[PDB]
Amino acid sequence: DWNFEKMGIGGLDKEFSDIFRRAFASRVFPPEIVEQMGCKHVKGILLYGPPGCGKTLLARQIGKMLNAREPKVVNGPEILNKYVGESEANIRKLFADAEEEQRRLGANSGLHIIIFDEIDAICKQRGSMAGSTGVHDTVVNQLLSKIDGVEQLNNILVIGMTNRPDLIDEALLRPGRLEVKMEIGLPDEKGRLQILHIHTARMRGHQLLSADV
Amino acid sequence: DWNFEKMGIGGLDKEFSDIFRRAFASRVFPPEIVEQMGCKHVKGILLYGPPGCGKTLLARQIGKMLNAREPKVVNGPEILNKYVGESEANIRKLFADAEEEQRRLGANSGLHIIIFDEIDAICKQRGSMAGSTGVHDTVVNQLLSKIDGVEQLNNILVIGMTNRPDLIDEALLRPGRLEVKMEIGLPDEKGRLQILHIHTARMRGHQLLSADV
Amino acid sequence: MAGRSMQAARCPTDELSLSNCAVVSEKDYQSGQHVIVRTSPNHKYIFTLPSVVPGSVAFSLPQRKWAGLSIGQEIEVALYSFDKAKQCIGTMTIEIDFLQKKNIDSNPYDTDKMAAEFIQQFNNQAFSVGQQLVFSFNDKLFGLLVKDIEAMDPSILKGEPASGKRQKIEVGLVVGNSQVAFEKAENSSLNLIGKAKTKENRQSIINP
Numbered sequence: 001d002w003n004f005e006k007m008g009i010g011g012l013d014k015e016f017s018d019i020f021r022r023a024f025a026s027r028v029f030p031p032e033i034v035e036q037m038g039c040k041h042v043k044g045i046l047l048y049g050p051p052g053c054g055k056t057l058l059a060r061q062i063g064k065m066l067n068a069r070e071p072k073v074v075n076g077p078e079i080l081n082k083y084v085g086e087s088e089a090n091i092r093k094l095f096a097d098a099e100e101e102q103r104r105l106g107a108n109s110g111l112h113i114i115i116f117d118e119i120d121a122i123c124k125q126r127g128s129m130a131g132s133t134g135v136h137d138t139v140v141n142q143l144l145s146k147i148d149g150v151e152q153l154n155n156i157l158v159i160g161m162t163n164r165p166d167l168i169d170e171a172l173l174r175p176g177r178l179e180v181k182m183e184i185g186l187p188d189e190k191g192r193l194q195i196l197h198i199h200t201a202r203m204r205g206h207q208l209l210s211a212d213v
Numbered sequence: 214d215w216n217f218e219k220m221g222i223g224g225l226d227k228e229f230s231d232i233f234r235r236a237f238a239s240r241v242f243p244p245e246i247v248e249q250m251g252c253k254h255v256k257g258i259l260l261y262g263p264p265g266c267g268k269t270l271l272a273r274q275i276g277k278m279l280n281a282r283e284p285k286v287v288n289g290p291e292i293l294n295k296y297v298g299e300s301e302a303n304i305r306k307l308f309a310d311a312e313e314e315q316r317r318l319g320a321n322s323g324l325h326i327i328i329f330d331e332i333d334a335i336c337k338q339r340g341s342m343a344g345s346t347g348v349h350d351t352v353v354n355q356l357l358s359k360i361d362g363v364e365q366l367n368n369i370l371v372i373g374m375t376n377r378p379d380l381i382d383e384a385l386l387r388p389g390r391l392e393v394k395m396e397i398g399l400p401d402e403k404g405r406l407q408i409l410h411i412h413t414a415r416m417r418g419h420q421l422l423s424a425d426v
Numbered sequence: 427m428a429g430r431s432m433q434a435a436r437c438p439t440d441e442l443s444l445s446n447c448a449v450v451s452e453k454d455y456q457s458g459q460h461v462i463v464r465t466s467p468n469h470k471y472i473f474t475l476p477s478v479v480p481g482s483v484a485f486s487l488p489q490r491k492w493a494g495l496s497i498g499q500e501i502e503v504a505l506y507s508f509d510k511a512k513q514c515i516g517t518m519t520i521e522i523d524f525l526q527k528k529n530i531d532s533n534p535y536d537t538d539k540m541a542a543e544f545i546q547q548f549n550n551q552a553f554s555v556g557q558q559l560v561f562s563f564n565d566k567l568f569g570l571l572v573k574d575i576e577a578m579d580p581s582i583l584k585g586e587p588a589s590g591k592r593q594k595i596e597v598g599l600v601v602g603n604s605q606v607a608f609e610k611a612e613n614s615s616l617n618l619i620g621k622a623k624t625k626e627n628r629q630s631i632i633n634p
């Protein structure tokens with residue numbers, strides 16, 4: 001049933017086109033030709049921008065767009081825990097299922113989508129951190145190993161949103177983990193019109209808006 | 214059994230009227246027109262001003278005014294704790310009842326009120342504590358994520374009082390989190406007169422005031 | 427279960443003092459039964475149960491110190507309703523130091539061993555908050571003081587993923603999968619590690 005109009009997105013035409021281009025072109029072609037080229041698939045996205053533009057909305061609409069297993073969402077720093085090493089247990093529990101599925105089916109398995117929220121709370125520069133809590137460093141390193149370690153996993157997509165992109169570590173923003181880094185900005189008059197029509201559709205439908213507007 | 218003169222507040226008629234218009238208008242209007250309208254309630258109010266003007270009185274009287282469950286009150290920095298991850302758990306422990314009821318009764322659910330005193334003690338602009346900031350930023354991110362995350366709550370109302378509005382992080386003040394911003398200032402002469410009668414009603418009633426005053 | 431009047435006796439042996447059991451005659455009660463000892467209307471202590479006189483209950487010096495029991499006091503002895511799938515600890519927090527200050531050293535002790543040994547030695551025993559006991563490793567002696575008790579979530583007992591809603595309990599039962607943590611009392615030298623011996627991240631301010 002999907003069509004662009006049902007997602008309710010505003011004036012983010014160019015960004016959406018670029019995302020679909022740079023992230024989803026491979027999966028749409030027949031397996032034969034894509035195998036002929038022999039290219040690898042993206043597994044990460046990093047949206048950023050000023051507060052209150054709709055980043056989470058885009059992520060959830062992206063989730064709706066894909067037919068796949070229900071995304072696993074890590075709502076901020078829910079991973080930290082007071083016992084030593086317990087957070088790493090949680091992290092690995094995330095990837096266990098995907099690993100097992102890919103082992104059982106091989107190259108022709110389904111896709112798994114993972115959404116990380118408030119990524120800056122977890123991942124900050126390992127070196128630039130309060131000496132007292134190496135738990136952060138272990139988490140970052142463990143994560144880096146898991147997402148891109150010697151072993152390759154290719155049925156995962158990771159989404160990360162923040163508000164102050166400077167704080168993010170350099171080691172994570174490299175090709176293979178998050179290369180595509182988008183900037184969302186203010187819309188123009190047409191996008192504002194689209195939003196207003198979206199938020200006025202019911203008022204026109206139920207005839208509760210005067211014609212003088 | 215509610216009467217405006219019973220709460221013994223004088224000199225803030227205009228602010229209270231505006232507050233009532235912005236906050237409780239949706240929940241008192243008959244529903245059917247509202248479902249036709251398709252809107253969502255507002256879940257944030259902040260009050261600020263110089264010391265000793267009567268903010269806490271407004272909060273307490275508002276809490277008594279509404280017909281709902283006994284409000285949950287947090288007295289300053291009660292959330293900090295010596296073990297990592299417990300602050301976050303406590304924070305979640307604030308919203309767990311709301312989540313349960315939302316899941317169970319859906320639209321037909323009661324209202325929940327949470328009051329934060331001295332919010333400036335726990336919420337400060339991220340990246341401003343030189344040491345031990347590991348706990349502070351987690352706290353701030355947790356609160357932001359809890360108020361508005363992928364999951365949506367529709368049975369929560371938040372009222373806050375503060376003395377230093379310009380030191381707070383911008384992320385907590387965007388529309389959708391704390392919309393109704395109110396300033397309580399010094400009263401004028403008429404308010405002083407009203408207040409003096411308010412606080413001298415019992416004495417006048419019992420004839421303990423001389424006739425030459 | 428009706429209370430019996432009993433006389434407080436002295437624990438017959440130090441070996442029995444190491445078991446943390448209240449020692450009774452076989453005529454009175456069976457090994458592994460649990461009792462509530464009432465010393466006054468407001469004080470109820472729960473304990474796990476040939477040389478003991480029938481009609482007497484012999485208490486060790488630590489148990490008597492913790493519970494305030496004198497030898498020869500008449501006491502009412504009954505039983506606790508020890509809930510089944512709840513209490514049984516999920517993890518516990520204990521304070522540790524060298525039992526006597528003369529043995530102190532500062533090199534690290536591999537201490538996951540000491541927790542596994544703790545679970546092996548005191549399996550299925552009752553434990554409560556505030557209780558004091560003694561432990562031994564590397565032929566060195568340690569004093570211990572329980573400070574917190576989280577149960578298992580009953581879901582784990584049901585064979586289901588834990589919610590994280592661990593209840594905190596006034597008494598817990600050690601079972602073959604319980605865990606324990608050993609935080610030092612500040613003044614100390616006993617370096618420790620293991621890995622699972624547990625030390626919550628200290629979250630302590632420091633001034634430059």
Ligand SMILES: Nc1ncnc2c1ncn2[C@@H]1O[C@H](COP(=O)(O)OP(=O)(O)OP(=O)(O)O)[C@@H](O)[C@H]1O
Binds near residue numbers: 009058387
């Ligand atoms: N461009 C937009 N298109 C549609 N709705 C929008 C847009 N910008 C804001 N909104 C409305 O306001 C909300 C603000 O965006 P959202 O909740 O995704 O926050 P965010 O900007 O991702 O997060 P943060 O405020 O933490 O930086 C949207 O969920 C939506 O209800």
Ligand SMILES: Nc1ncnc2c1ncn2[C@@H]1O[C@H](COP(=O)(O)OP(=O)(O)OP(=O)(O)O)[C@@H](O)[C@H]1O
Binds near residue numbers: 221263269270271376
């Ligand atoms: N506008 C007012 N009308 C009536 N009484 C008032 C008013 N302002 C203050 N009072 C009286 O002053 C008392 C103290 O006010 P209150 O503690 O609410 O101030 P506050 O602004 O909450 O405090 P602060 O900002 O200094 O922490 C009130 O309980 C009330 O008796």
